[PDB]
Amino acid sequence: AVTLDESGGGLQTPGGTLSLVCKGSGFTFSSYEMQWVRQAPGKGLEWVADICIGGSYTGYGPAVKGRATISRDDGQSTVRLQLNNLRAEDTGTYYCAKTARSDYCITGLDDIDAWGHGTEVIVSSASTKGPSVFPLAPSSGGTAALGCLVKDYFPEPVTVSWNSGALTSGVHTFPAVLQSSGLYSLSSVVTVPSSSLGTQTYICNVNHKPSNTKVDKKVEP
Amino acid sequence: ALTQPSSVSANPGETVKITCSGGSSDYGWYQQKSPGSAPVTVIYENNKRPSDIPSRFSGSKFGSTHTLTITGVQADDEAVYFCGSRDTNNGAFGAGTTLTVLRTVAAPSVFIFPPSDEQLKSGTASVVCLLNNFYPREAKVQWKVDNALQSGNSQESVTEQDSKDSTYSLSSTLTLSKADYEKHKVYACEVTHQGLSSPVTKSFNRG
Amino acid sequence: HVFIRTELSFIKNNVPCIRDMFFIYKRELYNICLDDLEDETHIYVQKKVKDSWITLNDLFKETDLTGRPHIFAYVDVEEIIILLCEDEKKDMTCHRFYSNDGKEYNNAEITISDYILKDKLLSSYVSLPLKIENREYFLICGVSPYKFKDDNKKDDILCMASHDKGETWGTKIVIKYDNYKLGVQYFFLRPYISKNDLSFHFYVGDNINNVKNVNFIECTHEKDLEFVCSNRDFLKDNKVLQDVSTLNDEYIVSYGNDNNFAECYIFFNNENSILIKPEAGCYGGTFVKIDENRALFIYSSSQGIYNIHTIYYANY
Ligand SMILES: [N+]
């Protein structure tokens, strides 16, 4: 069960420093070259840095050169990326990665065999805002639609699950759009038949990790 | 930089081939169905494949060119595949290739949603126009408030191709203030699509 | 009076090298592993990190030429330079790799126009700059395989030098070897530089594998760019001469019990002695000098296992 879990990804200050930790399990850590790869919102994949076996070698991407710092606690099975003087250009999702070959550090990005879940970082000088949940009821025939609107919240992301992870069929998750003010707007709908209107209870669970707000809003026509 | 195609397309069951011309060292391919979500290693060494990845994926490095092959494409094979190799200075990634699975034309079942009680009282209320399970991505959204075209104050949000029925979904929102929402009564949403002879316009009353 | 201290470690290697070429750069041990068993051939630059060889870069991947080339690696103070040279021609065509960390390498295809070492047998080795008159020089040296008449016009050992870190090879070091005996093959000539003094360590035998008697000649600097060598008799009865190095301005000579090297014996200044007896043999044992008072003695007692004998020596 070769797995990697990232932590430390949040809304850091522009000018401040970052600290992302990647804990590895399932494989013999210390025997494999570790790397960090980020992805700016909308933009493609980008290599950040790599650390060789026993920290003997340390390489960085031009974008983060003279600012980032990769280290490894081979005992705790962790890789720390410490990026200083955070520009808005650093905003994105960071994924740590494991090289397939043990005791092998050739400079290439063709040998990745294990990717971490990905932690999101936001370089901004804006305070965390709470998500306002507004239920949307239809004013259909055979199939009706229900859902809630998540408006005025910052920063990303937001995990919305229907019935605490029980209702997964017919659930469409939309990407958030940046408003003219600066906050985001995420939407989520679920296709259910007209015969289930009244006998079943549908609640949208909006979870916002940065501001810690869990509001259970019921959608009822 | 690694020269990777902008996008490639194929019908289900048909064999596809994606290329990567730039770069010197060996090549790798990583699929990513949605941005933000972790990529999955599809091939690591030139012709090496992980145990979890199915037998249909195969690589081949002929000169500076490497071709990723998907024989008998499936619905769960739709993703933005990335190229991984080394550039003249250090390790580098490709621009990304978006794979689209060819299917029949699907019309969008439009669902218009009026704002909630609280939304109105909050000084700013927005109208939601929803387009579900259509094909292809070719679509247009035009707002018509009281028989008048509205443009500039509307942003759209498109989702990636579905991994089951290969359909898309649109989400429009007319950003309006409390003072400008109560002045009008008829709110219409014009939907333009390739698989539609006449634009389906759903309208709702204020009362 | 004297000081001898010997500790040993092991190094695992997951790359089955056909031939190893050890070197010390910035007081650290590296290897130039040749991996050649769809045969992707490699000339990996590995580095000792704890008890394992870590592969840092493949030089053959960035190479236009084919076949196992001639590898000449030079280790100066602030850089490594490695050359990969096609053996088979009027001009020699090398690929010059430069690094200053041990991992990052930047190749450049070089051409030794109308080289002198044509007709002479060359072989891969690790060397270090040889200073002559306020100028350091890298040496590509070759030997004449067979000799039948004592021609003076033609010298037996020929060296082409470069005083620009391997960029241009226009200097010719004159080697005068007065004990070049007729009829037999001469091979694996590799120069040994230490204290800006030149010597050569070569083999004299019937075939590359059939008969392999180790020879060692020490050279003195006679005049501007010209050296004159003579043999050094390291022969010990009932013992096979293997490697020769220098610590404390004294020779460190390795001997085997027989041509199968079940046991090795190390002599210091011929005054002192130690025994290496792998519990496997000590075949292919070589000194990798690190310092004036510290050297390594490496042999591989299995495929993938290296025995790193570290030797400390000091005389007063
Ligand atoms: N790597």
Numbering used by the authors:
A (entry chain B): 20 to 158, 163 to 244
B (entry chain C): 23 to 229
C (entry chain A): 32 to 68, 72 to 122, 128 to 318, 325 to 361
Sentences from the paper on this structure:
The leading vaccine candidates for a P. falciparum blood-stage malaria vaccine are members of a heterotrimeric complex containing reticulocyte-binding protein homolog 5 (RH5), cysteine-rich protective antigen (CyRPA), and RH5-interacting protein (RIPR), collectively called the “RCR complex”. Each member of this complex is highly conserved, essential for erythrocyte invasion, and capable of inducing cross-strain neutralizing antibodies. The leading blood-stage malaria vaccine candidate, CyRPA, is essential for invasion of Plasmodium falciparum into human erythrocytes. Here, we describe a panel of monoclonal antibodies (mAbs) that target CyRPA and that achieve greater parasite neutralization than other anti-CyRPA mAbs reported to date.
Cy.007 binding is mediated exclusively by blade 1. The c12 epitope largely overlaps with that of Cy.007, but slight differences in the binding epitope results in clashes with Cy.004, explaining the observed competition. In comparison, the less inhibitory mAbs Cy.003 and Cy.007 had higher affinities of 3.8×10−8 and 1.1×10−7 M, respectively. Synergy due to an allosteric mechanism was ruled out since structural studies show that binding by Cy.003, Cy.004, and Cy.007 caused no conformational changes in CyRPA. Comparable decreases were observed for Cy.007, with a kd of 1.6×10−3s−1 for CyRPA alone compared to 2.4×10−4s−1 and 3.8×10−4s−1 in the presence of Cy.004 and Cy.009 respectively. In contrast, synergy was observed when Cy.003, Cy.004, Cy.007, and Cy.009 were used in combination.
